[PDB]
Amino acid sequence: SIVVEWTNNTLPLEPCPKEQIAGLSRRIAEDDGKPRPAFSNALEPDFKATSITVTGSGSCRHLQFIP
């Protein structure tokens, strides 16, 4: 399995943009880990996504967004 980690460098640093990160999180994943078709179809055919995780860091170090 290939675990790929990235950051969206458009997010503001402070204060914690929890509402912006949430929207970005639910756009690629459902309530659980399941990737949405926008994300599956974009990474296909070269990469097939199984599970997505979005955890907070920095100003959002305490929150978690996608299980």
Partner: protein, 159 residues
């Protein structure tokens, strides 16, 4: 022959760790007298006329005259490359330009860390710069940001 000439240096390519960059060669870079603009000439990217390798984080398509790449943490700093333009007289002209690789735009103060698990082995990505370049471009497309480099790769590991 003719000598092909340099009017406007490629000058500066600003790049960031983990972020795809793309620079298409302008037509007013080289200007020959007999062959005109930078488009018709044969362009080759070089380091002592040492060709860019297949695992190089910088690449150059001679057909589209497109320079692109994806640097990692070991490439931070300023880099000087040389663009060779060969005319239909066989002569060459050289443009020395600079690629300055900065640190990741947010570093470790990023508000969120995204992870995704795929099917395969991390070697197939961590060996081929192009497969890793596709990954980063498709990650941007997943957010509707196709060809924007709104994605900064943080790590690739096995799980």
């Amino acid at each position: 022959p003719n000598r092909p000439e340099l009017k406007n240096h490629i000058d500066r390519v600003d790049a960031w760790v983990g972020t795809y960059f793309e620079v298409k060669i302008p037509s007013d870079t080289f200007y020959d007298h007999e062959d005109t603009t930078t488009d018709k000439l044969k362009l080759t990217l070089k380091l002592e006329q040492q060709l860019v390798g297949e695992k190089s984080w910088v690449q150059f398509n001679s057909n589209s005259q497109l320079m692109y790449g994806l640097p990692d943490s070991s490439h931070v700093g300023k880099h000087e490359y040389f663009m060779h333009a060969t005319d239909k007289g066989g002569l060459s002209a050289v443009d020395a330009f600079e690629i300055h690789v900065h640190r990741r735009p947010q570093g470790d103060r990023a508000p969120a860390r995204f992870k995704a698990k795929f099917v395969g082995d991390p070697a197939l990505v961590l060996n081929d710069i192009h497969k890793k370049i596709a990954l980063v471009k498709k990650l941007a497309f997943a957010f509707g940001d196709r060809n924007c480099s709104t994605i900064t790769l943080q790590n690739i590991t096995r799980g």
